[PDB]
């Protein structure tokens with residue numbers, strides 16, 4: 001049925017982010033950090049144009065064979081080249097599983113109201129993956145061994161792939177009934193660009209904040225190392241709550257208004273992080289940041305599907321490749337550019353710049369109220 005497709009997409013995204021986040025703490029044991037995101041950004045539009053040619057089931061199932069190969073390559077690698085190869089393979093997989101899975105979800109839940117909350121649930125998949133990533137990784141790392149986290153995650157990826165092969169049955173190539181509108185015509189749409197830009201700036205704010213916040217906490221607050229890991233918890237829990245609630249709330253409120261308010265709340269929250277003196281001062285603003293990132297993503301993915309349905313041809317592979325490029329731009333240029341700006345003009349000014357950009361971008365979501373057909 002359809003809820004099994006939703007579960008498959010949720011599980012793919014959850015395992016993808018659990019791997020992406022267990023790799024972080026164990027990696028130490030610069031380019032490697034941005035490698036996955038940039039390779040996924042490169043191979044997003046290709047998958048977008050491919051799902052319209054072979055269908056959704058096959059490029060979503062290749063996303064389990066690529067993520068499984070990446071996972072096992074992480075557990076038995078020592079060299080730096082091999083870790084880079086593993087992270088690039090994870091990037092290609094994630095591209096396959098995010099783009100093809102969101103396309104499948106939009107193709108199956110073909111109703112504007114239902115698509116909202118199923119996108120919300122699939123997105124909360126990423127929050128549940130990031131949130132349960134580090135603890136699982138650590139406990140399995142030290143209580144069993146250094147190859148343990150990745151081999152157990154590989155077993156989980158295999159079980160998810162078994163569910164995939166039993167639900168989707170990717171045996172045969174099935175092209176779409178109608179040829180989807182080209183990628184350039186989509187990219188010339190002022191509304192698809194506004195949606196992608198709102199997702200891009202929200203996630204770039206959060207992706208520049210995550211790595212820059214610990215480097216500032218150890219300098220201003222004299223925080224211990226456990227504090228650095230705990231100070232970012234409100235973001236993930238709040239993103240989980242925000243996505244799961246606003247998938248259902250945004251269509252009653254209006255997706256344009258939910259996106260506008262999410263942008264303004266991300267802006268204000270990020271403008272209000274540098275004013276915190278102690279760790280208890282980074283609970284409320286980080287909560288606001290994560291809550292509003294969810295408020296924006298759970299409102300702007302269904303809108304992507306809707307904007308394609310209303311104006312262009314009903315093929316969702318490319319437009320969700322565009323949405324996933326907007327996602328990945330932030331996580332690719334986040335660490336590097338954020339560290340560069342913080343190393344040059346400081347962390348408070350970086351946060352003020354990001355907040356100003358988000359607040360000034362917010363009024364552009366007004367143009368999503370009633371776009372013409």
Ligand SMILES: NCCc1ccc(O)c(O)c1
Pocket residue numbers: 126127130203206210235236239290293297
């Ligand atoms: N679209 C995902 C945004 C997100 C959510 C939680 C996080 O912890 C994070 O770093 C990023």
